[PDB]
Amino acid sequence: MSETIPVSVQCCEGRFELSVDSNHTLRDVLRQFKREVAALDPINLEEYVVNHEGKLLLDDSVTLQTVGVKKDSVFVLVRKA
């Protein structure tokens, strides 16, 4: 608990916020977000795409900072199909 980073996520069903330390790639942020979103979201979010900081990323190899995310870090999730 030395370097905390608050983040906010928007969903068509509601809103979900979380706090995690920056170090790993988006794969980490999404891993937790999707791991928790499943609590209320029965459908597999993996079949959908999520935009970070108003920007749609291709893979999760880039880090939060690599993408250019701000302190607030706002990402929205939407169903593509």
DSSP notation for the chain: --S--EEEEE-SS-EEEEE--S-SBHHHHHHHHHHHHTTT--S-GGGSEEEETTEE-S-S-SBHHHHT--SS-EEEEE---
Angle of CA points 76, 49, 3, to nearest 5°: 55
Full residue range of the structural domain in which residue 48 is found: 1-81
- Identify the burial level of 58 via C-beta atoms within 10 angstroms of its C-beta, where 0-12 means exposed, 13-18 middle and 19 or more buried: exposed
Bridge partners of 6, per DSSP, are 19
Please give the tally of structural domains in the chain.
1
CB atoms within 10 A of CB 64: 22
- Experimental method used, please? NMR
